[PDB]
Ligand binder design. Structure first.
Ligand code: CLA
Ligand code: CLA
Ligand code: CLA
Ligand code: CLA
Ligand code: CLA
Ligand code: CLA
Ligand code: CLA
Ligand code: CLA
Ligand code: CLA
Ligand SMILES: CC1=C(C/C=C(\C)CCC[C@H](C)CCC[C@H](C)CCCC(C)C)C(=O)c2ccccc2C1=O
Ligand code: SF4
Ligand code: SF4
Lengths: 162, 34, 223, 171, 72, 73, 130, 30, 80, 147
């Protein structure tokens, strides 16, 4: 709800509940960090959901193609390694956050090269944000549908449980 | 100690230790200054 | 397919022609860089930016070539020395440490399943090399599933390594055809010249032609 | 926008500021590594490097050595551990000779200033010159670095052997 | 060593030198002698030495093994 | 032919020019030195001849080997 | 954008100087140009001159002299090359007496001149153990 | 079959020939 | 550093000086030829040994001769 | 980067790896060394000749000792046309069981002797592994003399 990147045509500066009208710059940076992290994690989660459903080469097959079921089938020592890798990545991100000129979601340090941003750079950042938002909605829907129905995405669609 | 233990005592000794010390000495010598 | 001399000759001839033509394309790229390249007309474009970081490209290609050669050929030599030492279980073989080309076998499986699943209007796979039945004409095999094992892994990586080294020689010739740290005015000597002299420790074969010469040698090796 | 620019505004260096050389991720990741982590003595840097290196070095020797075992064997683990320790010894010998022939300094970040201020009209290369201002760039610093590398390599190799034995036995 | 001459190996060595100088975790280690390609005469000698050693070794192996394996 | 290539690939122009010097001396002694002065092949041409002969010899050896083997069996 | 305003508008190349031209010696070539002509760097690719003072740094004297030889094609003649030691030890190199070496200038003495042809050189056997 | 004493004293004499070799090597200078 | 010698067969045609890539040779006054000039080698410390100088020499067996000698980072053409 | 080619100051000032390479290949060209006279040349050549003859005698002594210790000279005396002479034993950790079995000769893996030393020493009147040991001892003594 500022001159921040992420304002698109359907709803420009979409803050209907006024979360940003009262927040300071630090809280807004925190909000942008949370939104970008959620969007990236959700894009990965949606892609993994689908691909796992129609392709699970690892673990010598097995590891039932329905997600939320393979969640309880991974050896639980591979879960620990994924957890530790995510933790090390976020430790590195925390270290990045104290670098001078840091921008909320910018872990590549594009502020080093991008002074006086263009419209293409802002448009690409907005594209990433919008894809992340769509993936957040999609992964929430995926998890809820799999919980209530018990079938996965391409399985529920194939049968016709819509 | 029998005579047939001499190969197992000497071949590793020569063929590994002597290269190591010789490399150390030669590298030190050729990398010296004045 | 049952005329084996014809198949072998056609494959070998066409691969030889392809290798020669590729070396020629590299040679004429170098010739363009030496002769027809205008620095003013190519300010900050792709050609300029490639020359500006030619070091990085050539150094990383050098590292890749060393990695691929070390691995492929040294696995071959390790197999040879393990066999010569009477240690048959230490080889990089199928009945030993096995390097299965799983990615290529996955593709082979995908093609043999294509008719009716991904190519639903197909009646048979494109080639029986990916899998299927043995096709024989007059008791002579025409085509048959080509199994890929650890032997094909090693030879395929040998192919990749040789191709990478040929690319290294030719790309080093093209990128360093105009100038270098040795000869900052190599473009003034032309595309075809023997050297700049015995100085600088020796400046043999610095041309770009002398790179199409070495690349011809390495193309011969690869093909 | 352009994501490649001359390094530190110098178009004549043999270097570029790409999204890999000068990215915030690269900065933080290299600044958390033992070789560049702030607040570490050279002995601590050497100890951490040796620990990590022995830890990942025992792996290939134990797994693919001349005395492998598809099951867990104490002899295979001992062979891998001894090979890793001897390789660490060879690396420590290399470090020692490299430091012996490279530096002649016992306290850096000062001698450079002393010869930039109080003149250096001597045989040079010890008073003047002096490449690098890190504490690793001294005779004393590199000696402690090698000592730490060697001790940490032994400790990390032993720890990795213990972990391998536990994983192979209790899993 | 005989077919490929110098000049082609000096520029490659320069690229390797740049790669070593511009990479982290390896900048801490630097050479004392500047790595350069072998001289023309040295390259000729090294190629001749390889040629001769390979020649002698392969023929010694062939003659000895052939005599032993053919005549019992 | 492949072995012939190695004469051009391994040698250098100066030796051949100085040998042509003595051959030209013999021709002049017999009054049969050509007006077009004989010169050893240039360095680049020596390399080109070497690589052409090397490629021809190797490819021809593989050609004969492949053809005879695959025609016999 | 760049450290100095007189630098040519070059985007930087991984072919410039290395750690050697920070502890042994570096070479700087200066020249004044009437036009912002586009020229090719001796190290990498295309750079743009400044309509005025231009200053470029290189790792070798040969690189600076190749750049200067290229400048002559732009009718640029006032280019001058200096050698800089590890500290600011500037020494004028190429226009040593202000006149290019190809043009005869008074005040130059012959260095390395032998008052005989090649055939007058002494026999090597008489130059043994000296 | 030669004894341990025969091989041992040959090794000892070989050592003496080694010390004579380094003395010649060092006398031929660095 | 390499050694460069000039011989009185010099005709002062300046082709050696304008071919040197490292500014080693220069033209100096002389009275042994029509041009009144002879090549000089006052900066042999920059000599690289490329021998472009004697490739441009028109005299019969050369008037500039380059004798390769001890090597230096300047004479080896090392940018590193 | 200094002091290795002690005999050549021109090489010792080379900042490149060429100094090391040329230091090896010019070590025996005494006439080209720095601060060189003819007397020193002949004296150094003389001492090098002595060291060389010592090396030759040590090599012959080693052949004699290894035939006496790990060979089958005594067995070869009684049947020279059927027994294959053994040069020396083999101890290589890289051998598999198959290589050990194939190279196994009598008590240990060993190499057949292709130098013809068995026939030469038999002809000149050697019949015992103690005759070879005496020759090795005497040749090491001669090497010590020459050094
Ligand atoms: C939130 C992300 C996420 C999570 C938690 C999982 C979780 C899981 N996946 Mg999975 N997957 C994902 C994304 C994800 N996936 C994506 C995006 C793809 C497409 C390439 C896949 C493709 C995939 C396959 C093909 C298979 C699994 C399988 C599995 C299960 C076993 C773990 C495994 O082998 O992973 C394997 C994961 C991969 C091969 C790809 C992971 C690539 C990651 C997500 C991208 C890089 C991450 C990086 C380290 C961090 C980002 C850096 C920076 C942004 C900060 C487990 C339930 C296996 C299974 O049993 O299926 C039921 C299996 O066979 N996944
Ligand atoms: C640094 C290198 C490294 C090494 C040596 C290992 C080693 C291992 N990983 Mg692993 N892993 C790594 C990095 C590494 N990991 C990283 C960076 C990730 C991404 C987070 C993972 C994610 C991962 C998963 C998801 C799983 C493993 C598993 C395994 C084990 C089985 C591997 C195998 O082929 O069986 C020998 C083995 C202990 C598997 C395991 O432990 O199950 C038994 C498993 O399921 N790994
Ligand atoms: C991209 C947005 C999107 C789309 C296209 C769909 C599409 C669909 N949803 Mg849905 N859903 C979404 C997001 C979405 N959902 C989210 C974010 C949630 C969480 C609140 C849900 C929760 C949800 C439930 C609880 C149910 C569906 C159901 C359905 C199907 C009717 C249809 C396939 C129904 C279904 O398929 O089950 C019968 C159903 O019962 N959705
Ligand atoms: C030049 C002669 C010569 C040569 C080529 C060899 C070669 C060999 N000997 Mg040997 N040996 C020799 C003389 C020689 N011997 C003599 C004179 C003696 C009596 C002391 C021995 C006693 C001996 C024993 C007891 C054993 C060997 C063994 C071996 C083998 C492994 C190498 C080793 O452990 O060396 C060790 C050698 C010694 C301890 C003795 C020193 C060798 C001579 C005196 C030095 C010669 C130096 C040479 C002239 C130049 C040196 C170059 C140097 C500066 C780099 C190898 C086949 C081993 C074997 O059979 O394994 C299967 C083994 O156990 N040797
Ligand atoms: C005369 C020369 C020589 C000798 C004697 C050896 C000896 C050996 N090599 Mg080797 N090698 C050599 C030259 C030599 N190599 C060369 C030139 C090459 C390159 C072509 C190789 C390449 C090579 C490979 C690739 C491998 C060997 C291996 C081996 C070991 C045989 C395998 C085995 O059963 O041991 C089993 C080994 C152990 C049980 C542990 C041995 C670990 C070291 C050697 C013990 C040293 C102890 C030392 C005194 C410790 C110092 C104190 C320290 C704790 C601080 C053996 C130690 C194999 C091996 O074991 O790898 C380590 C192996 O994989 N070698
Ligand atoms: C059999 C002969 C032979 C061999 C082995 C090579 C090897 C190589 N050439 Mg080639 N070359 C040859 C003939 C050969 N060439 C001929 C005849 C020509 C004339 C036209 C050329 C012209 C040529 C050019 C123009 C170029 C090469 C390049 C390369 C390198 C590619 C990188 C690589 O694989 O390195 C890895 C090394 C090997 C595969 C060799 C074997 C190494 C073993 C298997 C592993 C390591 C062994 C181990 C270290 C031993 C230690 C023990 C020991 C100390 C005792 C490699 C060194 C390129 C280059 O510079 O490299 C990028 C390049 O640009 N070559
Ligand atoms: C490149 C070629 C190659 C390869 C891969 C191997 C591989 C192997 N050889 Mg071998 N060998 C080769 C060539 C090769 N050989 C040649 C040419 C010869 C003849 C001289 C031999 C002679 C030989 C002998 C005589 C023996 C072997 C043995 C072995 C095995 C154990 C070696 C060992 O201890 O590993 C040590 C490995 C390491 C210390 C680690 C090096 C590799 C690491 C993992 C690289 C990691 C890179 C990393 C991914 C970078 C990214 C990091 C990230 C954090 C950014 C192993 C399977 C032994 C055996 O019996 O095995 C069956 C044995 O006794 N070899
Ligand atoms: C030739 C390649 C090779 C091989 C065969 C191994 C083999 C192994 N590694 Mg390893 N590793 C390698 C390269 C390799 N590594 C490289 C290049 C790195 C650097 C990224 C690592 C980093 C690494 C870590 C960090 C760990 C291993 C671990 C292990 C062990 C996993 C099984 C177990 O019991 O632990 C389970 C196993 C012995 C694990 C281990 O030893 O645990 C005790 C472990 O934690 N590796
Ligand atoms: C005096 C001995 C001698 C010599 C010098 C030659 C010389 C030659 N023979 Mg040859 N030959 C001889 C005896 C000899 N022959 C005998 C006694 C026989 C038995 C009849 C043969 C049978 C024979 C055949 C059947 C072939 C040759 C070929 C050749 C040519 C190879 C040219 C080349 O550059 O190879 C470059 C070398 C290679 C490209 C690799 C050589 C093949 C190796 C062994 C395969 C290994 C590949 C493996 C996957 C790893 C490769 C890694 C690396 C290549 C990257 C060359 C003219 C071949 C030819 O035309 O060219 C190859 C050929 O087809 N000869
Ligand atoms: C022999 C040789 C010469 C001398 C070679 C000469 C002078 C070529 C002479 C060719 C004759 C005069 C014509 C060709 C005669 C052939 C019989 C014709 C070819 C055969 C047909 C079937 C094509 C060089 O000049 C040279 C230069 C650089 C490196 C190596 C070498 C080199 O090895
Ligand atoms: S060696 Fe280098 S310089 Fe001398 S001739 Fe052959 S190529 Fe030209
Ligand atoms: S070598 Fe010949 S050309 Fe190159 S600098 Fe020395 S003199 Fe001038």
């Amino acid at each position: 709800l500022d001159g921040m990147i992420g304002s698109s045509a359907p709803f420009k500066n979409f803050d209907p509940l006024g979360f940003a009208a009262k927040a300071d710059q630090k809280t807004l940076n925190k909000y942008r960090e949370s939104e970008l992290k959620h969007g990236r994690v959700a894009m990965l989660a949606v892609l993994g959901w689908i691909v796992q459903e129609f392709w699970h080469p690892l673990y010598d097959g097995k590891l039932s193609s329905n997600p939320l079921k393979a969640l309880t089938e991974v050896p639980l020592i591979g879960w620990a390694q994924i957890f530790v890798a995510i933790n090390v990545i976020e430790y590195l991100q925390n270290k990045i956050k104290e670098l001078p000129g840091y921008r909320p979601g910018d872990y590549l340090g594009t502020w080093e090269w991008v002074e006086q941003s263009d419209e293409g750079w802002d448009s690409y950042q907005t594209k990433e944000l919008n894809n992340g938002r769509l993936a957040m909605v999609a992964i929430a829907g995926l998890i809820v549908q799999d919980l209530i129905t018990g079938q996965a995405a391409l399985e529920q669609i194939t049968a016709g449980n819509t | 100690m029998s005579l047939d233990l001499l190969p197992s005592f000497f071949v590793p000794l020569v063929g590994l230790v002597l290269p190591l010390f010789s490399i150390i000495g030669l590298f030190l010598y050729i990398e010296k200054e004045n | 397919a049952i005329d084996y001399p014809t198949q072998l000759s056609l494959f070998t001839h066409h691969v030889w022609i392809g290798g020669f033509c590729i070396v020629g394309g590299a040679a004429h790229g170098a010739i363009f860089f030496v002769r027809d390249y205008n620095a003013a007309n190519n300010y900050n474009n792709l050609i300029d930016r490639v020359i500006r970081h030619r070091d990085a490209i050539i150094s990383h290609l050098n590292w890749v070539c060393i990695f691929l050669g070390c691995h492929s050929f040294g696995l071959y030599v390790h197999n040879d020395t393990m066999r010569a030492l009477g240690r048959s279980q230490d080889l990089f073989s199928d009945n030993a440490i096995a390097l299965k080309p799983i990615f290529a076998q996955f593709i082979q499986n995908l093609h043999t399943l294509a008719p009716g699943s991904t190519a639903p209007n197909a009646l048979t796979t494109v080639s029986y090399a990916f899998g299927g039945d043995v096709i024989s004409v007059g008791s002579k095999i025409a085509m048959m599933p080509i199994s890929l094992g650890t032997a094909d892994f090693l030879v395929h990586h040998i192919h990749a390594f040789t191709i990478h080294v040929t690319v290294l020689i030719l790309l080093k010739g093209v990128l360093y055809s105009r100038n270098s740290r040795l000869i900052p005015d190599k473009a003034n000597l032309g595309f075809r010249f023997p050297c700049d002299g015995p100085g600088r420790g020796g400046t043999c074969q610095v041309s770009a032609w002398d790179h199409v010469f070495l690349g011809l040698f390495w193309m011969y090796n690869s093909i | 926008v352009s994501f490649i620019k001359p390094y530190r505004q110098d178009p004549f260096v043999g270097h570029l500021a790409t999204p890999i050389t000068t990215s915030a991720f690269t900065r933080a990741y290299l600044k958390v590594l033992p070789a560049y982590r702030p607040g570490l003595t050279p002995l601590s840097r050497g100890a951490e490097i040796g620990f990590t290196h022995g830890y990942f070095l025992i792996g290939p020797f134990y797994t693919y050595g001349p005395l492998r075992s598809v099951e867990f064997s104490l002899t295979s683990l001992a062979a891998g551990l001894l090979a890793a320790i001897t390789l660490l010894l060879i690396l420590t010998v290399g470090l020692s000779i490299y430091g012996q022939v490279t530096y002649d300094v016992y306290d850096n970040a000062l001698i450079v200033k002393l010869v930039r201020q109080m003149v250096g009209s001597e045989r040079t290369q010890d008073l003047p010159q002096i490449k690098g201002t890190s504490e690793l760039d001294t005779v004393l610093g590199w000696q402690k670095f090698s000592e730490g590398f060697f001790s940490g390599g032994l400790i990390g190799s032993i720890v990795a052997a213990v972990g391998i034995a536990l994983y192979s036995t209790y899993l | 060593f005989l077919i490929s001459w110098r000049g082609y190996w000096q520029e490659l060595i320069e690229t390797i030198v740049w790669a070593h100088e511009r990479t982290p975790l390896a900048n801490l280690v630097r050479w004392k002698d500047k790595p350069v390609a072998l001289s023309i005469v040295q390259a000729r000698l090294v190629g001749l030495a390889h040629f001769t050693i390979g020649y002698v070794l392969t023929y010694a192996a062939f003659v000895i093994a052939s005599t032993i394996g053919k005549l019992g | 032919i492949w072995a012939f290539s190695l004469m051009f690939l391994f040698s250098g122009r100066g030796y051949w020019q100085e040998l042509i010097e003595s051959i030209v001396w013999a021709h002049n002694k017999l009054k049969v030195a050509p007006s077009i002065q004989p010169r050893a092949l240039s360095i680049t041409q020596g390399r080109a001849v070497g690589v052409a002969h090397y490629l021809l010899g190797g490819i021809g050896t593989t050609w004969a080997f492949f053809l005879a083997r695959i025609i016999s069996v | 954008k760049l450290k100095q305003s007189d630098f040519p508008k070059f985007e930087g190349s991984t072919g410039g100087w290395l750690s050697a031209a920070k502890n042994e010696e570096k070479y700087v070539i200066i020249w004044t140009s009437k036009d912002a002509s586009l020229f090719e760097m001796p190290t990498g690719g295309t750079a743009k001159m400044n309509a005025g003072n231009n200053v470029a740094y290189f790792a070798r004297k040969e690189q600076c002299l190749a750049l200067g030889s290229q400048l002559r094609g732009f009718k640029i003649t006032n280019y001058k090359i200096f050698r800089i030691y590890p500290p600011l030890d500037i020494t004028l190199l190429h226009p040593f007496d202000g006149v290019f070496p190809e043009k005869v200038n008074q005040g130059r003495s012959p260095v390395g001149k032998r008052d005989a042809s090649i055939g007058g050189n002494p026999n090597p056997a008489s130059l043994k153990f000296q | 079959m030669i004894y341990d004493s025969q091989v041992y004293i040959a090794l000892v004499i070989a050592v003496v020939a080694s010390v004579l070799a380094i003395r010649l090597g060092a006398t031929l200078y660095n | 550093s390499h050694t460069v010698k000039i011989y009185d067969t010099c005709i002062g045609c300046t082709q050696c000086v304008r071919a040197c890539p490292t500014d080693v040779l220069e033209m100096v006054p002389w009275d042994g030829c029509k041009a009144g000039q002879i090549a000089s080698a006052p900066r042999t410390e920059d000599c690289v040994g490329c021998k472009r100088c004697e490739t441009a020499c028109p005299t019969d067996f050369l008037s500039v001769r380059v004798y390769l000698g001890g090597e230096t980072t300047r004479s080896l053409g090392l940018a590193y | 980067v200094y002091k290795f080619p002690k005999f050549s100051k021109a090489l010792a000032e080379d900042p490149s790896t060429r100094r090391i390479w040329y230091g090896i290949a010019t070590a025996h060209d005494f006439e080209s060394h720095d601060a060189m006279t003819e007397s020193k040349l002949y004296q150094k050549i003389f001492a090098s000749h002595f060291g060389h003859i010592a090396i030759i005698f040590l090599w012959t002594a080693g052949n004699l000792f290894h035939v006496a210790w790990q060979g089958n000279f005594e067995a070869w005396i009684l049947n020279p046309l059927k027994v294959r002479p053994i040069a020396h034993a083999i101890w290589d950790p890289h051998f598999g069981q198959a290589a050990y079995k194939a190279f196994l000769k009598t008590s240990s893996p060993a190499n057949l002797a292709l130098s013809g030393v068995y026939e030469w020493w038999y002809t000149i009147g050697m019949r015992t592994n103690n005759d070879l040991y005496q020759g090795s001892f005497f040749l090491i003594l001669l090497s010590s003399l020459l050094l």
